[PDB]
Amino acid sequence: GPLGSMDAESIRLNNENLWAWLVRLLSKNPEWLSAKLRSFLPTMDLDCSYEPSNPEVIHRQLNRLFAQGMATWKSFINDLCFELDVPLDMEIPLVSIWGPR
Numbered sequence: 001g002p003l004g005s006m007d008a009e010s011i012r013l014n015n016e017n018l019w020a021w022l023v024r025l026l027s028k029n030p031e032w033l034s035a036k037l038r039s040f041l042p043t044m045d046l047d048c049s050y051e052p053s054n055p056e057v058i059h060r061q062l063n064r065l066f067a068q069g070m071a072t073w074k075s076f077i078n079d080l081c082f083e084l085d086v087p088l089d090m091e092i093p094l095v096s097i098w099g100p101r
Helices: 016-027 030-040 055-068 070-083 091-098
Strands: none
Touching (some): 030 055, 055 070
């Protein structure tokens, strides 16, 4: 819907549950991730995979996005929800994932 502000993130704030969900679902889509990461990270060192789809390995990839932009994260999650078909709730709850704790 039309949002006057983008502060829905602070409202829908959740992270542990969302991260676990994100980690597992994205682990089922390393293919999507790498592809999208190339758009975000211009120097996408996605070839670096010491470990497979491990939680921290996933974290590593998402870390990179936080380095691009906090706004870039908000943008990424928009596509994440869109391209992965699954309706999580809204992208912005997930965008707020790096907020409190």
